[PDB]
Ligand binder design. Structure first.
Ligand SMILES: [Mg+2]
Ligand SMILES: [Mg+2]
Ligand SMILES: [Mg+2]
Ligand SMILES: [Mg+2]
Lengths: 462, 460
């Protein structure tokens, strides 16, 4: 006898209890689809790091294991939600190709970290790191069992659980030009084999070309997921995800040459997945508003090792790493005057999404709870990069700008430019909505304690 | 506003930002997809947890007590069970019993030690460490408290979860005699820091209707939640836990779903089951055992569910959706030892086996089995031994069959018996789909090398 069962995915048809042939084909297509779609979210963090490594080796063409200097707007433009204040020193490499690598870090006041491909923190660097700003030598060891017994004396031995690692550093001193010329030249990476040191690799300077490490879309996304899997070992927590991608044509040790049917499912997974990433990130259902009555929320909810008590933070890391890159102890600092804190808002005081054609205003109260500096940077929602405007000015930082008499500071966001507020203006873009992070570099007590707070952005012109 | 159509509905955006409605729909579809995939993930553990719930609340045996299953009524509730070898099975939660010893006598048995997800911890008896000579197995809880417990004289088993399973089968043809000798000498016994508790004898299964098969709708989710509570969280399952969180399922918290969560879970159970059937019956991860036939070796999963670069999520869900337990021995390549299982759900025409029709299976002479062979009919819906008016769900070589001149045997399946073949007949129910397992107890080299082969089930 036949029987039909309606469902969210369509009518399920059975013949003599067994599913019909067509229903099985459909279900296996639905299963592969759902699996690919959820894998999309699972892959957000690694996609970012992998795509950065591709740019480094293929576009910038830096030596495998070589660091890069990012400072100018054109250099930083490709970095997801980067700031346009602190000089960056960044590098990504595959430990399997480089072998044990050393990171000779100079004595200076920097903020940084060591990350694995999925962006878990292996160690902070400089001030809030083992060296405490005094400098030191960090040996990064490949997860290969070969190097299991590698523990050389005189180094901060770091052992990532994957091959594709990442290192990032920031110059915190306001005398940018002076410090870079004093610290960067001394920052270097260096091979280490058996018991002999190799040639030191200097920090190269990033070229002036169009680029970005943001996760790609369509099938490009899967090709890179496939790449992530090929360059790294398979970790226990990811064994089921691997099982779920198998029939989509993605497997470790096998080329990615998907069939048409696999492509069709994958294209859909990328589309629906992207929408879900947006949804999970802007909703941020696992956290709450930093300040009641506002849409401001601490942007970083993920743990350093991505471990909660009974689960690994798939959603928390999916949200934060969808719009940003890296995390560290400092980035979640509760130490007065050290590290940084990040608050984000995607809407105005009416809960409406911020769009580049309207005029907005953010009232920054006096005595901002920050020791080094504070800033507001605008990013485009679509790419989550510093919005490219006519002015060539992505943000506003504690610098040369109009300051109210009560010591408050008003920031304006709009297409054109408010009169008298030319120093405190942010040029948006017609119907190209955006958002922004309010950076706290060297956050004090009143920011942690919620003694000092701000309101959401208010709409001005229609 | 922009709109992008998709396989899950039209996606709407306001200035690039997803609309409020779209975000809600995405989170909803996200939870649905996750719960649907978790359903498949939990197939194995569900079968065992449900059995332990029956042992505790329906049979009401002690936590840690074994059960004797032998009559059709006793085994009826066991997923794809045989009606040939007496069973001695039990399931318990180590955290509740504490270290538990399995006092195994000397005998020709086939059994295993499984964890909640049905990974093999060890084989028992003949193909096990005691080699049929008998012995004592000490199953230790995963807690860090007993992390050093390693007393001499026992076979120390270290499960990774709390809910474990123990199964044994009497292989001897003299069932009435061997049962009386062996089962009375089988017991489980608590071990607490050196001292032994009282021995727990095997209890006969009460005459009542039961089944450990996974439940449907929200009943399945309540049990998945229970599995979570009763066992620690393992690394490989950390993301499944993350995905279940917003559906109202977390360890350490009660299961009290919101109206919205229940709607998602019900659909997930419905779509998850259909996917379970599809994954199982299609078996795209394997192929026919004998070329040109629908027969396939029913077991593809590895003892520890570990393949080279992934854990066998699909192979696990396929075989455990239609069966229970695994061991080195149901995958034996050792001649005359262990068992092997072949399955078919379709006739030679590729059509689903349905009870309203009459079929015939031609079993060649010299079946490659040193102990016995059989064909058991199971219903597709519950995957339990077929319930017919005849009270006979199978045909085994132990029975009184009408052998052929050349020694071959003709088995018939139908709602009505075939002229002079009642002894080689298994009654089926019209309109009800069925499938069958062909068991090889004591498989010979002719089975492994494919030298001996059998055709598909013919219609009419
Ligand atoms: Mg930054
Ligand atoms: Mg930092
Ligand atoms: Mg059996
Ligand atoms: Mg066995």
């Amino acid at each position: 006898q036949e029987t039909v069962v309606p469902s969210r995915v369509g009518d399920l048809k059975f013949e003599s209890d067994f599913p019909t042939q067509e229903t099985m084909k459909n279900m296996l297509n639905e299963m592969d689809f759902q699996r690919a779609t959820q894998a999309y979210l699972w892959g957000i963090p690694a996609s970012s790091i992998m795509e950065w490594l591709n740019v480094s080796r293929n576009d910038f063409k830096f030596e495998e294991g070589q660091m890069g200097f990012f400072n100018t707007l054109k250099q930083k433009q490709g970095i997801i939600t980067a700031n346009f204040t602190t000089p960056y020193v960044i590098g990504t490499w595959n430990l399997e190709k480089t072998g044990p690598l050393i990171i000779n870090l100079p004595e200076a006041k920097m903020a940084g970290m060591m990350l694995d491909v999925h962006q878990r923190v292996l160690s902070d660097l400089s001030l809030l790191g083992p060296d405490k700003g005094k400098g030191g030598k960090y040996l990064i060891v490949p997860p290969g069992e070969k190097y299991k017994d590698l523990n050389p004396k005189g180094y901060y031995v770091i052992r990532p659980k994957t091959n594709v690692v990442y290192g990032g550093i920031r110059i915190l001193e306001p005398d940018v030009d002076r410090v870079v010329k004093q610290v960067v030249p001394n920052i270097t990476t260096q091979p280490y084999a058996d018991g002999k040191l190799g040639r030191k690799i200097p920090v190269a300077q990033v070229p002036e070309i169009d680029w970005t490490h943001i996760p790609k879309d369509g099938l490009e996304y899967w090709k890179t997921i496939h790449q992530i899997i090929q360059e790294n070992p398979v970790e226990e927590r990811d064994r089921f995800v691997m099982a779920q991608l198998k029939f989509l044509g993605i497997e470790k040790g096998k080329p990615f040459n998907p069939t048409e049917e696999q492509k069709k499912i994958l294209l859909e997974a990328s589309k629906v997945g992207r929408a879900m990433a947006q949804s999970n990130d802007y909703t941020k259902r696992f956290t709450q508003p930093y300040w009641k009555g506002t849409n401001w929320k601490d942007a970083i909810s993920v743990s350093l090792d991505q471990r909660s008590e009974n689960y690994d933070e798939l959603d928390e890391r999916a949200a934060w790493f969808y719009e940003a890159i890296t995390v560290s102890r400092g980035m979640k600092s509760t130490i007065p005057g050290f590290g940084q804190r990040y608050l984000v808002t995607y809407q105005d005081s009416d809960g409406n999404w911020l769009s580049g054609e309207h005029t907005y205003k953010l009232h920054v109260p006096a005595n901002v709870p920050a020791s080094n500096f504070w800033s507001t940077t605008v990013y485009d929602e679509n790419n989550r990069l510093m919005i490219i405007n006519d002015a060539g000015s992505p943000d506003i930082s504690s610098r040369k700008n109009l300051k109210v008499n009560s010591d408050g500071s008003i920031d304006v966001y709009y297409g054109p430019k408010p009169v008298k507020g030319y120093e405190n203006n942010w040029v948006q873009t017609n119907p190209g909505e955006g958002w922004f992070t309010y950076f706290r570099f060297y956050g004090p007590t009143e920011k942690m304690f919620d003694k000092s707070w701000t309101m959401g952005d208010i709409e001005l012109v229609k």
